[model samples]
Target chain A: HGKQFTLYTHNSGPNGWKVAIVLEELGLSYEPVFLDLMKGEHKAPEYLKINPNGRVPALIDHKNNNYTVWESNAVTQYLVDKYDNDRKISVAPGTNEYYTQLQWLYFQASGQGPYYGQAAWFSVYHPEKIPSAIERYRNEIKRVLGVLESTLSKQEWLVGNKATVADFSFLTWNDIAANLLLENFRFEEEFPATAKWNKKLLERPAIAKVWEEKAKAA
Target chain B: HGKQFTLYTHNSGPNGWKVAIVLEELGLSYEPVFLDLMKGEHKAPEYLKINPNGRVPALIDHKNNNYTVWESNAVTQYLVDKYDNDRKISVAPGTNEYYTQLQWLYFQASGQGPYYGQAAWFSVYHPEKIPSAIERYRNEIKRVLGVLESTLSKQEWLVGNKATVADFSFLTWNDIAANLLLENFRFEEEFPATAKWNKKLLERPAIAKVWEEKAKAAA
Candidate 1:
């Protein structure tokens, strides 16, 4: 991978680190620019040019004509397409596994991320504590974990026998559970297979590197 | 395009009709099973076997080993991969345009659809009318449309020059904006480019056919 990439991210934000995990897994050299969400840097005029939506974890592939990609899942797909030529981290194009990979990716992004974010928000960030809102999202987090549990119980990985980017996508957000979103929510007890699969993924070198460093910095 | 498909959908949900429009556009024959959401048909155990999430717009691609694909955006990708051999409505994989297409598709799924649905939920369905939640989502819908306006101002379609499933994904939700979510939401005046783009997409034969017939049946 000859391309120099810059990932604009914040340490605490799970979506941003999702892109980071992908970059590290691909063994791509990249610079990380952490934007302060408290300072509104992500919403600033200059940053908006890169991601008009003004969210962090936007990647600028400097070598590829300086192309900018946002949306964490989209960024993961881009990195795999441009850099995963060996098919080490992704399924090849036109394979049934490729679409299966995407199915789980979209589920992680749309299904898991949003609900977990809501639970975190109502749990910690909202102006007023809204129990109903908190309960709604917490239950949703459990439901999503159940979905993963049902799938992982049957198969070793989300898509194929090997772990792919789709599994990596769920790491940061799902980690927020059991403590951040729902206190004493024992994932290992309720969704044991999913918890086992998550443990197996966390043991990977790339995931460990990205998460451990992000946690220390934050 | 010879595959026989079954689309599990509901008449009122936008995501379900999205799969329908794509099926009609590709000229593939699909049996449409309308799940009655009012009866909680979508949440029933039998339906969950097809879509674990208990949502409409899941596709069972029968010819391709009865493979079931849910999550509406994933369904569109699957259809194009298996059916659009000519690349009529999709950009080929490995092209910049293809990822650009995915960019918008994910944006639509995670950004536009969820926010718009929230606006609708707070406005119409929530146990108690929550003004703050409603306002937050309404503004988000406007912000998302603004992103589209900025993009559509420079290009006619979301990806490249032609209309794709990405553009079609927003139709039902955006249509709800002008009438349902935001009262007196002036699409033509406020977000002119997005309004024009929406009009262009609605004019497509497949879109017009699916929406018109769905509306007529409801009427």
Candidate 2:
């Protein structure tokens, strides 16, 4: 059985970084192949076969006869469940944490990313949309942030107090928001506990290693 | 340890049926407490405490000191994972199928549902945005339907050969679209495969039961 895995990714996409961060965090070995978005490689027929949506951070699990897992959040959860040494980010199967964690990941992919995405979209992707359209998404995004601020305020992480796949899944988007979304809202300025929690997350050696590798690649 | 499970939900909402459908498939006995959405019962403080979002389909496992799982699709998945009789609708936890199932489910929850929801919103909730907004979502909804139709044509259900939770999660929304938003689009004609697969889904005993339950509540 082939044990090696390959991740096709882009350099700066938040979704790609989510997987890269988890691989480094877990210390799992995998090959990183960069797909040039500026070249429109992701939309090619070959890539679309693996992911009909043609998004980044798709994995080919060679061990399972090269079974492909696309979608960034899915890959993060899968890698942690299968490879994490400490299992800090994911709960064991059949446990409440597993389902609950899945909920939070969905909460991020469905709730956090999409609303924040619209904020980016209207702000950047479609500056031409109606004034009301921009306001609607911007307002919705702030409402979602308030929810996150409240949740992160209550606990140290997104789901359980300790770090889990859910946090990585969600935070990857926020990591980009500060730069892309005009003004960065400092957590400490708004939510002290979330700021502290984020700072604590920043200290992980694996996360640092991943970012270093990314910096070199960039 | 508490095994007693109860779910609070409504009939007309697409998200609410998500939990009830899972319950029927699992064949696990539970009490169904219908919340009156028209009366704003779900927005009451007590319900809000259970789910801060105050949405329908909150599963209360009173057997375990009142553990509540909110979010309609999340609740459905959790129940099946925790309580399925033979694991009919899911796969091994760490298997590729499991993760693939999850990706498809997420696509439905985040992509398909919300997109359709926006179509509904502009169509009804915010009619003020109708003229310009309607064309945007209407085309996308048709595109999404075509995608599902193409996928369903290749298999019997979504995410697997048989009807899995992913199909159930998405099919319910398509059922809503025929009447709610796609008043002019014909599912049987435009999406023959999805329509056929949908008929097979409706024939399942559990689905039939929940559909009947939903219809009575709607009536």
Candidate 3:
């Protein structure tokens, strides 16, 4: 037995829970330190030292010499790279599937995650509502879902047969998009494949455990 | 000689230039297939096969059985994986520095590139200008640059002693932020460390090559 990995997280923020899915799936033991976003704790001096971006879902791998890493998607890569030696949940580096996996991983982080966050900003969090801004992101949210729905309609997973980190990586943001950001999104009804894929993601024991944890903590 | 790698790109876009810097840095032979964004070429049926997202900076590697790839930062990773044998613009996998380098690369892609893009969106592209929206993204631009400035001030390079793809990856977006996005940003004066870091980046031969070409090719 080794020291449990320390995860600096928040209850409701999707990014933190996104990493939790990977940790729970890999069966890596970790301690959760939930930060209060309302108190500006994420921006406080101490936490910023851990994640200079002042974002949630940063990890300290105590088993790996207490190595600290942040940015949710990057942390997942670090987790799988170190622990998934059997290629259990990851593809081999330099294989075609590997680059395809990286493509979607990068797409999830740089493409899907941010757009969903921005949509949340305009729709829910922005103090003064800007209709154009809100509409802008709503359209973006729909567009990304289309991309997901189109692909998942043809294949069982994002990468290949088994669910890789790339497949599970999207669960949290889609949760946000469906539940919070869009008013008349009809997300599930419209994008049945994506909705079905997400439902399958939550059914996994590890993913279910973390999903419930986030729901309860929130 | 093997066939040149075909880069599907746009003339003025930063994302395409970001990948171009890597190809030039590794001295990989490639042809540029510059797409006309104004003509809606990127979204055409053929281009969508290359990139479902309908964006610039997709790639085709003729040398490797014509493997097609997309997403600018991911394209850079693929290029280095196949070509960077000496670890020229990349780090060795499984090392601390390697993960650290990935941290910044993800930071650049997710953190910096998107914010700069949003700033450009509200400032330049959006038909109806919303003051609050513009102000919102401008603050974000400054904040992201603050993170960059703070880190670059402490370390010469992002990872180790030598420059890696993490360092070069930010050049195009930073260029957009300073030139097109922010108004009265005083960016060079406000964030001198980042400014100085970018200045040194442009001095590199590979980086300079792409900058010159992008300058001449922009619409």
**Model 3, B12-51: lDDT tens per residue?**
8888889989999999888888888899998898888788
Q: What lDDT score goes with residue A196 in model 1?
A: 92
DockQ of 2: 0.49
Put down candidate 3 lDDT per residue, A137-185, tens digits, no spaces: 8899889888888788989898858889999888888888888887876
Clashes of each: 0, 3, 0
- Residues B1-219, candidate 2: write the lDDT tens digits: 224777787767888787778877887667877889879998787886676555677888775566677767678777766676476877556566888887778778777777787777778776366465666677768877776775677776667566788888876788778877886767789899988878888898999999888878779
DockQ score for model 1: 0.70
Give RMSD (Å) of candidate 2 vs. truth.
Answer: 3.1
Can you list each candidate's DockQ? 0.70, 0.49, 0.73
Q: Considering only N, C-alpha and C atoms within 3 Å, which residue pairs clash in candidate 1?
A: none
Question: Model 1, range A8-93, lDDT digits (tens) per residue?
Answer: 99857888888888888998889888899899998898998888787777888888888888889988999997799998878887
Q: Which docking class does model 2 fall in?
A: medium
Give the poorly placed runs of model 2, Cα more than 4 Å off. Answer: A1-3, A36-40, A182-186, A211-218, B1-3, B33-45, B130-132
In candidate 3, position A14 carries an lDDT of 80
Candidate topping lDDT: 3
Look at candidate 1 and tell me the lDDT of residue B105.
Answer: 92
2 versus 3: better lDDT goes to: 3
DockQ of 3: 0.73
In candidate 3, which residue pairs clash? none
Measured with C-alpha atoms, the lDDT of residue A76 in candidate 1 is 92
